[PDB]
Amino acid sequence: MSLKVNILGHEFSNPFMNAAGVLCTTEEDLRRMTESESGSLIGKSCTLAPRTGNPEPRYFGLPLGSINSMGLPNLGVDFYLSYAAQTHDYSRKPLFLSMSGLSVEESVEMVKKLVPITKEKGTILELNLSCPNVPGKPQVGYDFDTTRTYLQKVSEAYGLPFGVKMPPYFDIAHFDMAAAVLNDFPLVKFITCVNSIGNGLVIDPANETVVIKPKQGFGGLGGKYVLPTALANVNAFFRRCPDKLVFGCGGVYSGEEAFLHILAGASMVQVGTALHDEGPIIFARLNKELQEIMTNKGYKTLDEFRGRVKTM
Amino acid sequence: MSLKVNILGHEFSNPFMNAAGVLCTTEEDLRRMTESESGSLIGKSCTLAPRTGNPEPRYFGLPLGSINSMGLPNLGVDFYLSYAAQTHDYSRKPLFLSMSGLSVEESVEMVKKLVPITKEKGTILELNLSCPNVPGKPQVGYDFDTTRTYLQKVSEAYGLPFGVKMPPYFDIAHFDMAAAVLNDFPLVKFITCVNSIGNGLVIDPANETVVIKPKQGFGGLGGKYVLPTALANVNAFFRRCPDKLVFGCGGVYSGEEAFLHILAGASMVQVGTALHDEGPIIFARLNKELQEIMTNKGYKTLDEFRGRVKTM
Numbered sequence: 001m002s003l004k005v006n007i008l009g010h011e012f013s014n015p016f017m018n019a020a021g022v023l024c025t026t027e028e029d030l031r032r033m034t035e036s037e038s039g040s041l042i043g044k045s046c047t048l049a050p051r052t053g054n055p056e057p058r059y060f061g062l063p064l065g066s067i068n069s070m071g072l073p074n075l076g077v078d079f080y081l082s083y084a085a086q087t088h089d090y091s092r093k094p095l096f097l098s099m100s101g102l103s104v105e106e107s108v109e110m111v112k113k114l115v116p117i118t119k120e121k122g123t124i125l126e127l128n129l130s131c132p133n134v135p136g137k138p139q140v141g142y143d144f145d146t147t148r149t150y151l152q153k154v155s156e157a158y159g160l161p162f163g164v165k166m167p168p169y170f171d172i173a174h175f176d177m178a179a180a181v182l183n184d185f186p187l188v189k190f191i192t193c194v195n196s197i198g199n200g201l202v203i204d205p206a207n208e209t210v211v212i213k214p215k216q217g218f219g220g221l222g223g224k225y226v227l228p229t230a231l232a233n234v235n236a237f238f239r240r241c242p243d244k245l246v247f248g249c250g251g252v253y254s255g256e257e258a259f260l261h262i263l264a265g266a267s268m269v270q271v272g273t274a275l276h277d278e279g280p281i282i283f284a285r286l287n288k289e290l291q292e293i294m295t296n297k298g299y300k301t302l303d304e305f306r307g308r309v310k311t312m
Numbered sequence: 313m314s315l316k317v318n319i320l321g322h323e324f325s326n327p328f329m330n331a332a333g334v335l336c337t338t339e340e341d342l343r344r345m346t347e348s349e350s351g352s353l354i355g356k357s358c359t360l361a362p363r364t365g366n367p368e369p370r371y372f373g374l375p376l377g378s379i380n381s382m383g384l385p386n387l388g389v390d391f392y393l394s395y396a397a398q399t400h401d402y403s404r405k406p407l408f409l410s411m412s413g414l415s416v417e418e419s420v421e422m423v424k425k426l427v428p429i430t431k432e433k434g435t436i437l438e439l440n441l442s443c444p445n446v447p448g449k450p451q452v453g454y455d456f457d458t459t460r461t462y463l464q465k466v467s468e469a470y471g472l473p474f475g476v477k478m479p480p481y482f483d484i485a486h487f488d489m490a491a492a493v494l495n496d497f498p499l500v501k502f503i504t505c506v507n508s509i510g511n512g513l514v515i516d517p518a519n520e521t522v523v524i525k526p527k528q529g530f531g532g533l534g535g536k537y538v539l540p541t542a543l544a545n546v547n548a549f550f551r552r553c554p555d556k557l558v559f560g561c562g563g564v565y566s567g568e569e570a571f572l573h574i575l576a577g578a579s580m581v582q583v584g585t586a587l588h589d590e591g592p593i594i595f596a597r598l599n600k601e602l603q604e605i606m607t608n609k610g611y612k613t614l615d616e617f618r619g620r621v622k623t624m
């Protein structure tokens with residue numbers, strides 16, 4: 001039996017990694033992910049200059065998941081580049097970096113700086129087009145003209161295969177339009193579905209008050225709230241972009257949800273809220289539960305059922 | 313202690329009604345809603361001609377809510393007009409009718425027929441701009457130019473106050489742009505937030521198969537999945553649309569959830585998934601639980617806390 005994944009010119013010991021933004025902001029975070037049993041890791045969505053993010057409280061754990069308005073707290077692109085160039089142990093596992101410039105001009109400058117490091121070390125880019133928590137910064141992925149611009153400029157400046165983190169879509173026309181944009185960019189080699197469900201609102205009935213401080217209580221939803229939306233997006237892009245990989249992100253707490261994501265088309269599976277709750281020990285448990293499920297079904301590799309969800 | 317709601321010319325005994333599409337397609341269904349302790353009721357979203365809807369299975373109850381791809385099964389607009397003109401007992405409670413023409417022209421023909429019945433009986437219109445389950449028919453509320461055309465043409469054709477059933481939004485700019493459109497139409501007196509979270513995907517791990525037949529398993533999500541999104545939309549439009557009412561729909565299973573909607577800004581509270589699960593006896597329970605919360609908090613009327621959620 002094998003959980004191995006061969007994509008992007010690497011072998012991954014297994015399909016699992018952190019969701020961007022969870023256990024990946026500091027060198028300590030990145031160390032703990034690296035020493036984890038995860039198949040991979042991705043660094044926090046970073047910006048050209050450092051950010052401290054939004055005021056507190058900006059995260060709230062819920063029975064069904066999470067709400068967050070972190071505000072892109074990050075140590076700045078130079079930290080993540082130095083990590084990727086100097087610190088990270090590639091014999092342990094491949095590294096992704098997430099980048100979330102707040103304008104096309106900022107993204108261009110950042111990805112340009114990654115090029116030499118990708119060439120030397122094999123560091124992979126995930127471009128974040130779906131941050132829902134910086135005030136006055138709408139989600140790029142909900143604007144297909146803007147999205148086309150970022151993909152054009154990043155394809156030109158970076159010039160190497162990369163991936164995109166997408167916001168959830170909820171309409172077939174949007175799947176169609178998103179894919180038509182993504183299919184115009186041959187350098188877009190994977191699509192991560194999905195970022196949090198943007199701009200939810202949680203209120204505490206006892207004190208009649210929102211639970212997070214920024215944006216009048218409005219923040220992105222992670223966890224159990226997101227699983228059906230995540231599965232849909234994964235499968236929708238899996239079908240519409242056959243020449244690209246899809247990565248699954250959303251609602252994974254167990255081997256079973258990972259199995260569903262893979263069945264829908266996911267090559268890699270990212271874990272956010274659950275990892276924030278349980279710590280990097282989850283990767284060991286997820287490998288065991290996924291192997292258990294496969295053993296029960298008599299599957300020996302992921303390739304036996306990846307993308308084989310059945311319709312009626 | 314009072315759950316009464318005074319809006320749009322009518323007195324409502326309590327803020328509760330069914331969500332469009334649940335317990336409201338047949339005369340029997342509407343009878344059961346009328347006999348219930350609900351403050352009001354709404355008829356199924358109807359089309360000019362009858363529809364049988366999507367093939368089966370097209371509904372699946374879930375631990376955290378529902379997925380449906382019903383496909384607008386309805387008896388046609390003449391059936392619902394006839395109920396509103398000849399059958400419904402207005403002394404019991406007011407009636408709404410939801411109309412979901414699949415083109416602006418269809419919608420126009422349908423609303424023109426409603427005018428004499430609204431004038432005579434007080435029947436209220438909710439225009440559905442958010443059906444996610446008819447193949448080849450994208451949700452109108454996700455196209456702000458299309459939305460403008462429908463509201464223009466319906467406003468002219470109907471010429472009386474009406475409401476709109478909106479899709480959930482997940483971006484602040486979408487809240488702003490939707491509000492900017494709605495605010496150009498003074499006849500739009502209320503906004504229902506929200507329709508189901510569109511185009512989710514549920515997969516059964518046991519048989520590795522989707523649970524609904526239409527659209528490769530893709531259907532609208534209801535229930536616990538949608539509460540934070542619903543609350544956000546209610547609040548967002550409550551603030552941006554001071555000349556209009558907001559109706560809350562989504563995640564309501566108890567008085568506490570109802571309380572949160574009202575605190576977010578809701579005038580009426582609709583109940584979908586939970587009514588499908590429990591039947592119309594639920595309305596007796598929701599009234600009791602809301603009364604209990606108001607009692608504990610010392611609120612004598614809904615007006616004392618409607619829209620008074622506290623931010624930090």
Ligand SMILES: Cc1cc2nc3c(=O)[nH]c(=O)nc-3n(C[C@H](O)[C@H](O)[C@H](O)COP(=O)(O)O)c2cc1C
Nearest residue numbers: 019020021045194195196222223250251271272273
């Ligand atoms: C605390 C927190 C911070 C996040 N930061 C990022 C980020 O920097 N970049 C990003 O692409 N997604 C970010 N996300 C979104 C997650 O990557 C993920 O898409 C979302 O939580 C859904 O996965 P889940 O249901 O496993 O939590 C963040 C989410 C959380 C909860």
Ligand SMILES: Cc1cc2nc3c(=O)[nH]c(=O)nc-3n(C[C@H](O)[C@H](O)[C@H](O)COP(=O)(O)O)c2cc1C
Nearest residue numbers: 331332333357506507508534535562563583584585
């Ligand atoms: C079986 C079913 C049928 C529905 N049909 C309609 C409909 O005809 N028109 C409509 O506007 N919404 C319809 N909806 C959406 C609900 O009115 C509601 O917006 C959504 O289910 C969220 O409410 P909930 O969380 O209480 O389920 C339907 C939902 C369900 C579960």
Ligand SMILES: O=C(O)c1cc(=O)[nH]c(=O)[nH]1
Nearest residue numbers: 070071072131133196220
């Ligand atoms: O840093 C955050 O606010 C953050 C970024 C992002 O992409 N997604 C999210 O849910 N939060």
Ligand SMILES: O=C(O)c1cc(=O)[nH]c(=O)[nH]1
Nearest residue numbers: 382383384443445508532
């Ligand atoms: O009839 C349906 O499919 C239906 C219509 C609508 O507006 N919302 C929904 O969830 N289903």
